[PDB]
Design a protein around this ligand. Structure first.
Ligand SMILES: [Cl-]
Ligand SMILES: [Cu+2]
Ligand SMILES: [Cu+2]
Ligand SMILES: [Cu+2]
Ligand SMILES: [Cu+2]
Ligand SMILES: [Cu+2]
Ligand SMILES: [Cu+2]
Ligand SMILES: [Cu+2]
Lengths: 471, 466
């Protein structure tokens, strides 16, 4: 009785509605779109076919389309250089490709089309998170080896702003370069090359020779990451957007700070400090027409993933490794981020060790729940935490598989869709969870080491629960 | 509100293994849980044109604890014939042959047999019936070889060449010619051959479906266009002793004796033509087949699981399945045409019937029905006792290979989007001949295998058919 009778998969896919899931492949070099209504992969593209010799396809965001099945557009970036060598793949390659491309891709109803390489046009090779603006007409990209981020206009493929962030440690000893505090300097960059182009293509600008991998923020203070400016790293990660407009939050993993920027006059306005027991924020001081500073007397713990709720009235930042928790700010005052204050912290007895890290997130459309991945190194099963986003309490945790990464949600709020990625060498898959029962409804196969996933949105309201407001 | 558990619960514990073609990957999926167990990306290892092409897996006592397989690659201008608007000017040479092992957690790239042996061969890979060796054929170079797995060494390699009766390219096959088969010997230090990368190519890419006409029309570039035969596969008699080498352009299957390493007879696909033509030895290492005309090309070739039937699919100028009685295991010169499967809807080049799989009991054979965009592609179901088409089922664009679960319950195939549109894994119930579902697949796969547990399973794997 253990073998099922012949069974069709139709009822399974029918439940989900008409939604397209888009994924990058990390070490596979691919991007793909899957139709959740039929099980078909609609299209894929392999970056090496186009002459990208190190296409570590990393992060992505897609823009609202009136009908994603007839067409949509998205940005996907890559890493490059010695990032090829940090996931245990026993490759003999001596000189890896430079990478750090930013690709604009359009689905036309049949296939993907590689529209442009925005890193080549602009000179900004940036390899970490990609986020769409709330209006769906621009996007940002950050990089945690260079510590630069930029917001870009989609129509003109041009840079609206770019900033460099640098650390100056109180103690030059690498072990204590963050623990004992420092000065963070934020600089508005101006392009140096003809055509208003920046000089940051490929590996140019890297302070460290490879990214700080998931769970590995502290490898740098341990002397396990090489580079020419090791104790000047902050590890920028993402620029996430307030769905109400005007503000974005730039996450810096090593100081555990989220810097709030005003997108109207392009200036940083306040620094939110992640660690439990530390102040809600620290002030930003302007020191020159293009330069601001934040002063920290210590850093208690690194932090990583960040996000606004759909209504913009809560901001989350995930402390990791030295504390593993979800820090929550009351951001209801849209006029003045200097007033945003800590309101809650989600903790759990099971999160007391170095791992699990509270990781990627997605909120339900109504804001009542947030789903948060729980990451561990091999071999402990990684999983999903379900959090009550009104009372700020852990409701349930579920084991899924190795190296759990990002989460998306269908726009009707009914299903969370996430990916796990096998540390680029073992089991991987797409996991789907019903948001009424909080149960896994199934795993689909996935050739991918994805660190991102999105459902293609139809409107700017869908972006409030996409790769716009959170990582 | 619906879980996928009952869906995956219908299948036995079977692993599906797939190459990705233009994705550059290889992957293994557990059909009992939906999880991808492991994948590998060839560009990570410095293969700069990893068109991951054909593969075969060997018997494993417990696939979930470990298994091993061969996967090869194509390279050169094969990168430029799928409509991808790449600006790459100098593609990687390719033609690698990789031995990969799954260890119960990940894939490990064991060796590059093409680099070790000096034979770079880019078309079908087949496992021997004992699971201790494998063959690779190449239809740009017209070379095939059988290899020993344990020692990663060459057991035999042969080159096949065409000398046309009429040197005009449009008439180079139609008006016949002489096919010369030459046993090759290594020419470099340490018993290495000198055929790595694009070395030895007569044409710049593998002929496409229906591509014989494009070659005749001067649309295929290459140094030796009128001397190609387009070798496709070396497929195995599951009873042992014999293999069949398919040559697409003359529509001939050359039968080799695997013990003495000599060709013994040439089966001729075309309906209306003789069962076979003799092979004449003309030197210690050279044999000839003489053809006064070539009536039509052929492609798919292979044995039923009992070894008693051999199939060869004529295409382009006829479109049918030719069937020989191969029950006489002692003497292939006696193998004789016994049936032909035709249909009013099969004429010309399309559908191109270029992959097949039999049920374990040999009662049915499932055949791919491939067409160019945008015609829907599908699967034909053929009764392999009466030799008649039963049904055709539409699947999707660019239908490729077919495998079967070793209990005989489900056909598992792949479709590949012409490397740019919709792709997927499709599963069909062999009792109802209905699709039960499609699962997503980032892949342009032109092969697929279910990992076997026994040598009997190879009778319905990438050994007896392609
Ligand atoms: Cl054998
Ligand atoms: Cu049972
Ligand atoms: Cu991140
Ligand atoms: Cu990542
Ligand atoms: Cu991640
Ligand atoms: Cu073939
Ligand atoms: Cu094929
Ligand atoms: Cu192929």
């Amino acid at each position: 009785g253990h073998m099922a009778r012949t069974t069709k998969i139709e009822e399974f896919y029918a439940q989900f509605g008409k939604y397209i899931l888009l994924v990058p492949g990390k070490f596979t070099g691919t991007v793909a779109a899957h139709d959740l209504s039929t099980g078909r992969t609609l299209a894929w593209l392999a970056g090496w076919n186009y002459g990208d010799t190190n296409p570590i396809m990393h992060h992505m965001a897609a823009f609202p389309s009136p009908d994603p099945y007839k067409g949509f557009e998205f940005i996907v970036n890559t890493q490059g250089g010695k990032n090829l060598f940090i996931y245990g793949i026993p490759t003999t390659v001596k000189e890896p490709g430079e990478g750090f491309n930013i690709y604009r891709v359009r689905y036309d109803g049949t296939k993907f089309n590689l529209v442009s390489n925005i890193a080549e046009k602009t000179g900004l090779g940036l390899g970490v998170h990609v986020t769409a603006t709330p209006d769906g007409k621009g996007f940002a990209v950050a990089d945690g080896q260079k510590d630069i981020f930029a917001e870009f206009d989609l129509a003109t493929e041009s840079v609206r702003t770019a900033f460099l962030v640098d650390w100056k440690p109180n103690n030059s000893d690498l072990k204590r370069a963050w623990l004992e505090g420092g000065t963070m300097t934020i600089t508005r960059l101006k392009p140096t090359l003809p055509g208003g182009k920046y000089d940051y293509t490929g590996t140019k600008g890297c302070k460290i020779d490879w990214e700080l991998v998931p769970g590995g923020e502290l490898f740098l203070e341990e002397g396990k990451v090489t580079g020419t400016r090791q104790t000047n790293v902050v590890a920028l990660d993402a620029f996430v957007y307030d769905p109400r407009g005007r503000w974005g939050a730039l996450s810096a993993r090593l100081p555990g700070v989220a810097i709030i920027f005003d997108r109207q006059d392009w200036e940083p306005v306040v620094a939110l400090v992640g660690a439990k027991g530390e102040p809600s924020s620290l002030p930003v001081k302007k020191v020159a027409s293009d330069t601001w500073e934040i002063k920290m007397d210590k850093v208690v713990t690194p932090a990583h993933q960040a996000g606004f709720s759909p209504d913009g009235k809560n901001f989350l930042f995930m402390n990791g490794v030295r504390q593993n928790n979800i820090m929550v700010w009351d951001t209801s005052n849209h006029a003045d981020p200097t007033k945003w204050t800590k309101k809650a912290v989600v903790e759990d007895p099971g999160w007391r060790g170095s791992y699990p890290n509270t990781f990627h997130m997605v909120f339900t459309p109504d804001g009542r729940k947030v789903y948060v991945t729980l990451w561990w190194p091999s071999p402990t099963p990684n999983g999903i935490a379900v959090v009550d986003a009104r009372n700020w309490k852990l409701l349930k945790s579920v084991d899924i598989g190795p190296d759990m990464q990002t989460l998306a949600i269908t726009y009707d709020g009914k299903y969370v869709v996430g990916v796990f990625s096998g540390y680029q060498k073992t089991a991987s898959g797409i996991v789907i969870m019903d948001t009424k029962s909080d149960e896994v409804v199934g795993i689909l196969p996935s050739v991918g080491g994805h660190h991102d996933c999105v459902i293609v949105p139809k409107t700017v309201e869908d972006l409030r629960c996409s790769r716009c407001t959170t990582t």
